[model samples]
Target: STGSATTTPIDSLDDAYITPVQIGTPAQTLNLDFDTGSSDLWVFSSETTASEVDGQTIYTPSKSTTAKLLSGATWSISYGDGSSSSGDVYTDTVSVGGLTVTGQAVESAKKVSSSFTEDSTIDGLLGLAFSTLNTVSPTQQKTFFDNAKASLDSPVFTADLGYHAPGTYNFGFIDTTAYTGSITYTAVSTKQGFWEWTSTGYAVGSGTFKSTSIDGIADTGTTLLYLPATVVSAYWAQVSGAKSSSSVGGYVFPCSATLPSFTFGVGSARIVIPGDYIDFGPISTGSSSCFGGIQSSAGIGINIFGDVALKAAFVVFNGATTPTLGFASK
Candidate 1:
């Protein structure tokens, strides 16, 4: 079976693309962020204290007839950006688009950090990474994609992430009409619960593409492109008045600066991120200073090809044996 869903941008933050998902027998619908960086299906739930939850919606598992608590099972997760959540586990029917899994592990959040509580748009996180990274205490859980793969015609999903625009996420099929040219594929290394791949090279603007090996993960949950400190320093060098400032957070530059295009090598195929996309937004509303969409992943361990980079290409997350990633112009 094939399934399709639409993703919406979260205002000017460009932080994440969120889609609707349903859990339980009667369907408790919630907006969830599909993340390739981490593996855990967690949502703000009735279990969360009222003081901890802001104006976000909560999933009440007790009201669902099909929801079954997994005795003693618990989960906790933390992200590179310092967001975290802890919760109990329940097995229930969960559906995304048209795909349904009868016994999917649905983590119900009892505690969440301020970073998560403040994001009122996102109700939970839907992990698309390998199931090996699931955070359940007693036993790890499979993601919706993993649980539904065997029933799908092909174990693949395509991410059509956009820049301040609506995009589509397709499961079990690739819509040829959604992309241009033939898809270029790169072998994925899932050792870290991510769609990790080695970038062949990168370049600033029209400069010659220098060959370099940079290991990074394609993370839909993250907002910006995070690379090595040296690479970030070099990329921002082309932008006049760009500086790494802690006060402004990451790299900041003049809002009027005409930034250069950033290109990354995916095997032999080159994906170019336009200069306009590099200028995320003004550091503060009505300010002349702007923050970059690309920053240093110095302490984050691995580079992240987040939404800023993914928006430039049509991405295919192949869940077949020897998982691979395919890219094409959108």
Candidate 2:
């Protein structure tokens, strides 16, 4: 079986992507963030506190004849800060695009963070990471992908994330016309339960490509590109008036400044991100200080090749027993 879905950027800033998913017998549709950074298909629902609810569409298990409560099972996902989202679990008929899974674990959020509430476009998150990272106590739950992989034509899925436009996520097969050149395949380390791989090196504009192994995760959930300080500092140094601002908490520069494109290596293949992609946007509505889409992951412990980088290529997540990640130019 196969499935496909269109993912759209939440806003012009390209902060995040949301895809439509249907859950329950009477199908309660909600726009969920397809996150490769975590593993837990959670959603805002009738169980959620009224105060925590915003404008996002919520799922009501009580309305679905196929929805069954998973007694004693609960889950929680923590943000870097103390904020988190937590709730009980339910098994229901879930479908994405045209793919259906009869008994899928659906986490119904009873509590959510303020940040999630503010993002009305996102109803919740659909995790595509390794199922081992699931937070359900006593018994872990498999992610939608994991549960559906065995029945798929191939145990794989592809992410064609876009730059301020809609993109496609295809399951069970790859459309040859969707990408250019042969895909560069590399093994992924699921030890950390992320689509973690090594970025061979990077180059700024037409500058020389540095030869180094930067370990990082290809996280669709993350908004910015994060690399070692040495690498990030060099990229910023090329731009006049660019500096890591303490107040803004990231590298910021004049919006009018000329910027250089960033290129990273996937083994022997190189993917180039447009300079404009790095100029995230102004720090504030009327501010001239524009925040950079790339930053240093000094204390984060892992480099993150987020939307800023993924948008430059077509990414394939192979779900075989020994998983691998593939990259190809668009």
Candidate 3:
């Protein structure tokens, strides 16, 4: 079996990407951020605090006859950004694209962080990471991919994330037409529950490639690309007026500065990210300062290949006995 779903950027700066998901019997549709960095399919729901319910669509489990509460089961999760959510658990028919998975764990958020409550662009998160990262207590639940992998012709899902446009998420098989050139495969280490991989090397703009191995994770949920401090300095230094601002928490450049493309290697394959892609719009409507799409991951324990990097290529998260990652030019 196979399936496909369309994902679109939430805002002009491409703050995040959201894919529509069908949850429950009558199919309460909700747009979710398909995050590979986390492992809990949680949503804002009727159980959430009334005052905290901003403009989000809530999932009313009582309306669905197919929904069954996982009695005594609860979940709580926290993110690196300091945002958190806690919820009750339910098992119901979850439909993604055209494929349906029965008894899929659907966490209903009773409380959410202010950062989420204020953002109405996304209703919740649909995690695709390994289930070991699931926060459910007493019982660990399977991710959407894990629950549906058995029926899939090929246990794989592909992400064709775009820059300020709609993209595609394909399950079971790779859509040959979605990418260009042959895909470069790399081994993934799931010991930590993330699709972690090692990048062979990198090159700043048209300069020579720096033969340095970098470990990072392909995180669809994250918004920016984060690398080593040295690499980030190298890339930002190339831009005359670019500087690492402690106040802004990242590299910022003059809006008029001409940006250069960044390229990273996967074996002999080179994936180039356009310069403008890094120019991440303006800091504000009329501000001269602009935040970069690339930032230093020094304080952050792990490097993150977020939407900024993923949108530059077609990514395949292969869920075979031995999980692997496939990157292709688009």
Candidate 4:
């Protein structure tokens, strides 16, 4: 929240303004899923020959106008999705919005898996979240912001999460239009990603829903909000006769009647998710189904606030400045 300048320049750019930062020429550009829950800039590279690299972007060192590789630092990341890939770290000349920053960190795959290379648009993702869970760990981790914050125009990096538009996660200088004066900054957490802390508690079935006093991790890469099953059930309990339906994907409840309002605490702010978020209605077969927050992994140790919840708030990631994160509403 400190009034600092961003490391990355944010502005409108024409086709010519879009500079080509060699994918691997200097280093393999990192394709990181910026999650406030955890910090890490990882990429699915061409070398990672793993099967999961199917749809994910693959760094084409050969095809890239620029490409390079780092020896001895190759690695493989395995996720709960049963997917994994192996790659080597390298240096690269990366560019954003026409600005070319040299010596950027990138992960290149010597043998990328199939799963990672299949349906995804690109070969990787550059995580613009926080620094805690970064690929550049205690021993070796350098974020784009960590490397370029010195030359940026502002000290803040804001993520618009543009209403589900493509390339919604684009990063650059945070427009202060939504905020006043300087933004507030939270202390960096020892945990991974940009471990942000917000007082936001969650509730289901109306504003009266009980408060689940816990820290909420904002993860944009995640598609759903993962909460304690008990918390989920508590919200669904208000849905008259809600039931679980696999065909619908998660929880399904009756929706013919009025539904309750779900909300959360964000600092002095309380954000809400309408009850219709849980009402999916009857399936193709005609049987009425109840839709609600899926109750899974109740005993699980972590509480993840997925995009569904985070979208309701204004998020400010200070990775381009200090290792801090901030949230607000416009």
Please, what are the lDDT tens digits per residue for candidate 2 over residues 1-330? 999999999999899999999999898999999989889999999999999998989999999999999999999999543457999999999898899998899999999999988889999999999999999887899999999998899999999999989999989998899999989998799999999999899999899999789999989989899999999999999999999998899899999988999999999999999998898889999999999998999988899999999999999999998999999999
* CA shift of 117, model 4, Å: 4.5
Poorest lDDT segment (10 consecutive residues) of candidate 4: 9-18
Candidate 4 residues 16-86, lDDT tens each? 01111234444444333443443334455555556555555456656555545555564455543455544
- Model 4 deviation from the true structure expressed as Cα RMSD, one decimal place: 6.8
How many residue pairs clash in each candidate at the backbone level?
A: 0, 0, 0, 80
Candidate ordering by TM-score (highest first) = 3, 2, 1, 4
Choose the strongest candidate by lDDT: 3
- RMSD for all candidates, in order, please: 1.1, 0.9, 0.7, 6.8
For candidate 1, give the lDDT: 0.90
Q: What's the lDDT for all of these models?
A: 0.90, 0.92, 0.93, 0.51
Candidate 1 versus the native: TM-score?
Answer: 0.98
| Each prediction's TM-score versus the true structure | 0.98, 0.98, 0.99, 0.71
Relative to the unseen true structure, what is the C-alpha lDDT of residue 136 in candidate 4, on a scale of 0 to 100? 40
Give the better candidate number (1 or 2) by TM-score.
2
Residue-level lDDT of model 3, residues 1-330, one tens digit each, is 998999999988889999999999899999999999999999999999888889999899999999999999999999978999998999999988998999999999999999999899899999998999999988989999999999999999999998879999999999999999999999899999999999998998899999889999999999999999999999999998999889887899999998999998887898999998898877878999999999999999999999889999999999999999999999
